[PDB]
Enzyme design. Structure first.
Site, PDB file in Angstrom:
ATOM      1  N   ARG A  14      -3.536 -14.664   0.567  1.00 18.28           N
ATOM      2  CA  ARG A  14      -2.571 -14.336   1.561  1.00 18.28           C
ATOM      3  C   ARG A  14      -3.059 -14.469   2.966  1.00 18.28           C
ATOM      4  O   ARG A  14      -4.168 -14.011   3.287  1.00 18.28           O
ATOM      5  CB  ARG A  14      -2.173 -12.909   1.383  1.00 18.28           C
ATOM      6  CG  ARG A  14      -1.133 -12.505   2.400  1.00 18.28           C
ATOM      7  CD  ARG A  14      -0.392 -11.628   1.544  1.00 18.28           C
ATOM      8  NE  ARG A  14      -0.024 -10.361   1.909  1.00 18.28           N
ATOM      9  CZ  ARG A  14       1.257  -9.999   2.142  1.00 18.28           C
ATOM     10  NH1 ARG A  14       2.278 -10.819   2.097  1.00 18.28           N
ATOM     11  NH2 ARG A  14       1.495  -8.743   2.424  1.00 18.28           N
ATOM     12  N   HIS A  74      -6.752 -10.942  -0.414  1.00 17.46           N
ATOM     13  CA  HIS A  74      -6.121 -10.514   0.848  1.00 17.46           C
ATOM     14  C   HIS A  74      -6.939 -11.092   2.003  1.00 17.46           C
ATOM     15  O   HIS A  74      -8.061 -10.664   2.265  1.00 17.46           O
ATOM     16  CB  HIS A  74      -6.000  -9.017   0.877  1.00 17.46           C
ATOM     17  CG  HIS A  74      -5.082  -8.484   1.929  1.00 17.46           C
ATOM     18  ND1 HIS A  74      -4.687  -9.202   3.030  1.00 17.46           N
ATOM     19  CD2 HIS A  74      -4.496  -7.279   2.041  1.00 17.46           C
ATOM     20  CE1 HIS A  74      -3.939  -8.448   3.815  1.00 17.46           C
ATOM     21  NE2 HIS A  74      -3.773  -7.282   3.215  1.00 17.46           N
ATOM     22  N   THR A 119       0.817  -1.214   0.000  1.00 14.80           N
ATOM     23  CA  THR A 119       0.000   0.000   0.000  1.00 14.80           C
ATOM     24  C   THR A 119       0.847   1.259   0.000  1.00 14.80           C
ATOM     25  O   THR A 119       1.684   1.423   0.856  1.00 14.80           O
ATOM     26  CB  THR A 119      -0.955  -0.017   1.208  1.00 14.80           C
ATOM     27  OG1 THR A 119      -1.895  -1.096   0.970  1.00 14.80           O
ATOM     28  CG2 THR A 119      -1.690   1.319   1.316  1.00 14.80           C
ATOM     29  N   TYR A 160      -7.520  -7.400   8.103  1.00 21.45           N
ATOM     30  CA  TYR A 160      -8.606  -6.827   7.314  1.00 21.45           C
ATOM     31  C   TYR A 160      -9.843  -7.790   7.337  1.00 21.45           C
ATOM     32  O   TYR A 160      -9.907  -8.688   8.223  1.00 21.45           O
ATOM     33  CB  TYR A 160      -8.063  -6.458   5.905  1.00 21.45           C
ATOM     34  CG  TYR A 160      -6.978  -5.401   6.086  1.00 21.45           C
ATOM     35  CD1 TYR A 160      -7.316  -4.111   6.396  1.00 21.45           C
ATOM     36  CD2 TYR A 160      -5.582  -5.737   5.970  1.00 21.45           C
ATOM     37  CE1 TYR A 160      -6.388  -3.099   6.562  1.00 21.45           C
ATOM     38  CE2 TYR A 160      -4.613  -4.737   6.176  1.00 21.45           C
ATOM     39  CZ  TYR A 160      -5.014  -3.428   6.444  1.00 21.45           C
ATOM     40  OH  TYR A 160      -4.101  -2.401   6.651  1.00 21.45           O
ATOM     41  N   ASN A 175      -3.481  -9.639   7.722  1.00 18.48           N
ATOM     42  CA  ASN A 175      -3.150  -8.352   8.303  1.00 18.48           C
ATOM     43  C   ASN A 175      -4.351  -7.591   8.935  1.00 18.48           C
ATOM     44  O   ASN A 175      -4.376  -6.352   9.015  1.00 18.48           O
ATOM     45  CB  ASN A 175      -2.458  -7.495   7.283  1.00 18.48           C
ATOM     46  CG  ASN A 175      -1.201  -8.118   6.729  1.00 18.48           C
ATOM     47  OD1 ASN A 175      -0.473  -8.866   7.401  1.00 18.48           O
ATOM     48  ND2 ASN A 175      -0.973  -7.840   5.483  1.00 18.48           N
ATOM     49  N   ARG A 230       9.599  -3.784   2.106  1.00 17.61           N
ATOM     50  CA  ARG A 230      10.212  -2.494   2.260  1.00 17.61           C
ATOM     51  C   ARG A 230      11.417  -2.313   1.381  1.00 17.61           C
ATOM     52  O   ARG A 230      11.653  -1.254   0.825  1.00 17.61           O
ATOM     53  CB  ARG A 230      10.597  -2.325   3.700  1.00 17.61           C
ATOM     54  CG  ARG A 230       9.357  -2.158   4.555  1.00 17.61           C
ATOM     55  CD  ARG A 230       9.701  -2.270   6.014  1.00 17.61           C
ATOM     56  NE  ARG A 230      10.018  -3.703   6.309  1.00 17.61           N
ATOM     57  CZ  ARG A 230      10.615  -4.193   7.408  1.00 17.61           C
ATOM     58  NH1 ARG A 230      10.989  -3.393   8.393  1.00 17.61           N
ATOM     59  NH2 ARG A 230      10.879  -5.513   7.512  1.00 17.61           N
TER      60      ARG A 230
HETATM   61  C1  LIG Z   1       4.173   0.618   3.151  1.00 13.56           C
HETATM   62  C2  LIG Z   1       3.672  -0.791   3.252  1.00 13.56           C
HETATM   63  C3  LIG Z   1       2.496  -1.162   2.592  1.00 13.56           C
HETATM   64  C4  LIG Z   1       1.967  -2.455   2.696  1.00 13.56           C
HETATM   65  N1  LIG Z   1       0.822  -2.730   2.031  1.00 13.56           N
HETATM   66  C5  LIG Z   1       0.322  -4.018   1.980  1.00 13.56           C
HETATM   67  C6  LIG Z   1      -0.880  -4.376   1.130  1.00 13.56           C
HETATM   68  O1  LIG Z   1      -1.389  -3.447   0.328  1.00 13.56           O
HETATM   69  N2  LIG Z   1      -1.293  -5.684   1.212  1.00 13.56           N
HETATM   70  C7  LIG Z   1      -0.622  -6.606   1.926  1.00 13.56           C
HETATM   71  O2  LIG Z   1      -0.977  -7.815   1.990  1.00 13.56           O
HETATM   72  N3  LIG Z   1       0.499  -6.356   2.693  1.00 13.56           N
HETATM   73  C8  LIG Z   1       1.058  -5.139   2.696  1.00 13.56           C
HETATM   74  N4  LIG Z   1       2.241  -4.867   3.398  1.00 13.56           N
HETATM   75  C9  LIG Z   1       2.947  -5.955   4.096  1.00 13.56           C
HETATM   76  C10 LIG Z   1       4.118  -6.371   3.092  1.00 13.56           C
HETATM   77  O3  LIG Z   1       3.719  -6.980   1.883  1.00 13.56           O
HETATM   78  C11 LIG Z   1       5.041  -7.430   3.689  1.00 13.56           C
HETATM   79  O4  LIG Z   1       4.209  -8.571   4.126  1.00 13.56           O
HETATM   80  C12 LIG Z   1       5.839  -6.740   4.835  1.00 13.56           C
HETATM   81  O5  LIG Z   1       6.377  -5.495   4.388  1.00 13.56           O
HETATM   82  C13 LIG Z   1       7.005  -7.582   5.354  1.00 13.56           C
HETATM   83  O6  LIG Z   1       7.961  -7.697   4.296  1.00 13.56           O
HETATM   84  P1  LIG Z   1       9.408  -6.947   4.426  1.00 13.56           P
HETATM   85  O7  LIG Z   1       9.968  -7.355   5.801  1.00 13.56           O
HETATM   86  O8  LIG Z   1      10.335  -7.458   3.326  1.00 13.56           O
HETATM   87  O9  LIG Z   1       8.967  -5.471   4.384  1.00 13.56           O
HETATM   88  C14 LIG Z   1       2.747  -3.548   3.357  1.00 13.56           C
HETATM   89  C15 LIG Z   1       3.927  -3.189   4.047  1.00 13.56           C
HETATM   90  C16 LIG Z   1       4.395  -1.877   4.031  1.00 13.56           C
HETATM   91  C17 LIG Z   1       5.676  -1.633   4.779  1.00 13.56           C
END
Ligand SMILES: Cc1cc2nc3c(=O)[nH]c(=O)nc-3n(C[C@H](O)[C@H](O)[C@H](O)COP(=O)(O)O)c2cc1C
Ligand SMILES: Cc1cc2nc3c(=O)[nH]c(=O)nc-3n(C[C@H](O)[C@H](O)[C@H](O)COP(=O)(O)O)c2cc1C
Lengths: 374, 390
Positions: free
Chosen positions: A241, A189, A35, A194, A192, A330
């Site tokens: 997911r 989805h 997001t 939702y 998380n 990230r």
């Molecule tokens: C800015 C941001 C936006 C995110 N948006 C979503 C999303 O739209 N849908 C989703 O399932 N997870 C989302 N996540 C979770 C990430 O996909 C991922 O599961 C999480 O960042 C851990 O991965 P990383 O440690 O490599 O960041 C988001 C994470 C961040 C940091």
């Protein structure tokens, strides 16, 4: 650059090709749904002006799987004005452009279908004449959210059987529109905190109809959505997911010892569907207990996402498990050329958390390539 | 000797002391429950003449956890005439002697309470005026077994709520009597396709009352037994055994992808009870068997699973049993997981001094399957301790 000793992944499982659904991936570094809040309001329209370049950059290594930012399949699914939708003609016209850019790069795009429930902003919904939905009327995410909903005169609402069905129709409509516009698949989805997670977790669902009160009942909405989407677009174009250990959104996580059984049930049911000829393209898991349990249940591809950027040893090790893709979140925000950098063991740009969710080009498409960074 | 190159385990976590229930174990090599059928018929009486010596021999390394052979907590639980019970005065007198021999050796003894269900021999039961019991009237373990029951005019009987309660009463009675006679603890047998497992597994339980039709209902009986036994003797003297991947007794195993959920649920319920103040001494899991190499490619992976999921749910001791004798590297690896005990079945039958042999990496005697279940001291107390090679 991020603080770790980089290691090249090019000779590991992470750089072996794999087929996922209809797509021949050239490697297993995945961009998970992220997001970013750059969509245009009003209309929840994808901001092709900035967004096309964002997804072009990140799909630049040929044969990358890209999962889009969470996308609302209906207005009532939503509540954040700068998140994109995929139910309207004008939304889809813009998505088509994005999909075209990823495909020009010979990469793949899967749209993540996101429904908020109790995580939405009740006053924004009220302005739009929309409900504040969840599994229940009374299990709020917290006292601050409760007071927010009351102040908006939009109290939380436990959805009816009829409204459940309307959601399922909206998932279907949105999945078919996505595929018709060129997407390679969709991801449901269910993580998380939702709406679908709100049903799965007993902390947010004590309903006493067939959608609550047991592991099987709590999984029912998720599984009806999967079955409807699979029927509309095929199991090969469907993924889902989960976040078993997530507590974001006031979910249980490991603090409830029955949480693993809830997920082992739902994944077992997906496995049963697969043995009957309808195997989902992949299950995506958020990393924290551990997710090891999945490998005893699901005999299909698994995407694991969480903390791998700073830990190439653990990425390497987890990729030795069968048909395992490794997602980077990230680090993909901050590294347009992440795939290359992982392959060659280059340093990674640090992310700027202050621009994760701003309506800006800055922190969106101005992160440098390795060459530019030097 | 078993045809393998033995490796010493004495410097691994296997030989680190650990406290299980009330007992300070000196090491983590465990003798799991092993049916040998030396009990005396009639009366299901432990055969002290031989059995005291059998358990004396295998408890010789001080501080070893011994789990007894499956033992019937009442007559109606049984159906194999040369398996012992632990309800009667005659039975208890001989158990007392057996427990004292283990304790003389500075070791510990937990009585496995075994209830047969549909695995029982229906004609044996019929002769004693006992039912042939299971979760349902109609889900037999196989056609041969159905015929055996019908020829005995003892058709399978899905037990009533009152009868489930009477079994629970018998577990409690047997646990208290076992502890009174000097047992360190008891183990509830909920594995290998016996009565409790027949309730756990949907393949043998489609009841439409609160004991069938969902994960939670299928678990109900097992958790009723746990709770009754824990209240009677305490959690620190109670354990339980599961076989998530077993197909023995016409159980589902991994072929049913919903099986892991069943076990994750039960184990999560036990973790909940633990967090609230009543933690079982240990959970005993049977490991998956070595797979059939002739399975087609797809069905190989379908059946496959491990017991690793337990460590994401239960925070107490785990005993793992199965295939370790010939794989010291795997025992070593599995023992590095938290509070993990390693059981040796067939190899403890054959090696009275198995603990010492694994400590120092000595050859292991071969087991003789022909005398696993014979009413003989031969193949019971005549396997030798290690004798130096010249
Ligand atoms: C800015 C941001 C936006 C995110 N948006 C979503 C999303 O739209 N849908 C989703 O399932 N997870 C989302 N996540 C979770 C990430 O996909 C991922 O599961 C999480 O960042 C851990 O991965 P990383 O440690 O490599 O960041 C988001 C994470 C961040 C940091
Ligand atoms: C002869 C024999 C008797 C057994 N009896 C019992 C029993 O009374 N209760 C039980 O839970 N398991 C019983 N088992 C299963 C063992 O405890 C153990 O799980 C199994 O032998 C696998 O371990 P191993 O590979 O080291 O032999 C028995 C196994 C054998 C070979």
């Amino acid at each position: 650059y991020m603080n770790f000793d980089p290691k090249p992944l090019g000779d590991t499982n992470i750089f072996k090709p794999i087929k996922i659904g209809n797509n021949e991936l050239k490697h297993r570094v995945v961009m998970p749904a992220l997001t970013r809040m750059r969509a245009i309001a009003p209309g929840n329209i994808p901001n092709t002006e900035w967004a096309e370049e964002y997804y072009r950059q990140r799909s630049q290594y040929p044969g990358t799987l890209i999962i889009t930012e969470g996308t609302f399949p209906s207005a009532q699914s939503g509540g954040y004005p700068n998140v994109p939708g995929i139910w309207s003609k004008e939304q889809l016209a813009e998505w088509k452009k994005i999909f075209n850019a990823i495909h020009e790069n010979k990469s793949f795009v899967w749209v993540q279908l996101w429904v908020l429930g109790r995580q939405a902003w009740p006053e924004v919904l009220k302005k739009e004449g929309l409900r504040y939905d969840s599994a229940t009327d009374d299990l709020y995410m917290g006292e601050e959210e409760k007071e927010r909903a009351l102040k908006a005169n939009n109290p939380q609402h436990g959805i009816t059987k009829e409204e459940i069905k309307q959601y399922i129709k909206e998932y279907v409509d949105a999945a078919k529109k996505a595929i018709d516009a060129g997407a390679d698949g969709v991801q449901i989805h269910s993580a998380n905190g939702y709406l679908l997670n709100q049903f799965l977790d007993p902390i947010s669902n004590n309903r006493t109809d067939e959608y609550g009160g047991s592991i099987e009942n709590r999984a029912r909405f998720t599984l009806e959505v999967v079955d409807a989407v699979v029927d509309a677009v095929g199991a090969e174009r469907t993924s889902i997911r989960f976040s078993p250990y997530g507590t974001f959104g006031t979910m249980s996580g490991g603090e409830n010892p029955g949480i693993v059984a809830q997920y082992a049930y739902v994944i077992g049911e997906l496995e049963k569907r697969a043995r009957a000829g309808k195997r989902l393209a992949f299950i995506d898991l958020v990393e924290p207990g551990t997710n090891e349990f999945i490998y005893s249940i699901w005999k299909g591809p698994v995407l694991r996402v969480g903390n791998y950027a700073l830990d190439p040893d653990q990425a390497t090790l987890d990729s030795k498990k069968p048909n395992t893709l490794i997602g980077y979140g990230r680090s993909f925000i901050a590294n347009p050329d992440l795939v290359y950098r992982l392959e060659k063991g280059l340093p990674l740009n640090k992310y700027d958390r202050n621009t994760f969710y701003t309506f800006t080009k800055e922190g969106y498409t101005d992160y440098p390539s390795y060459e530019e960074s030097v």
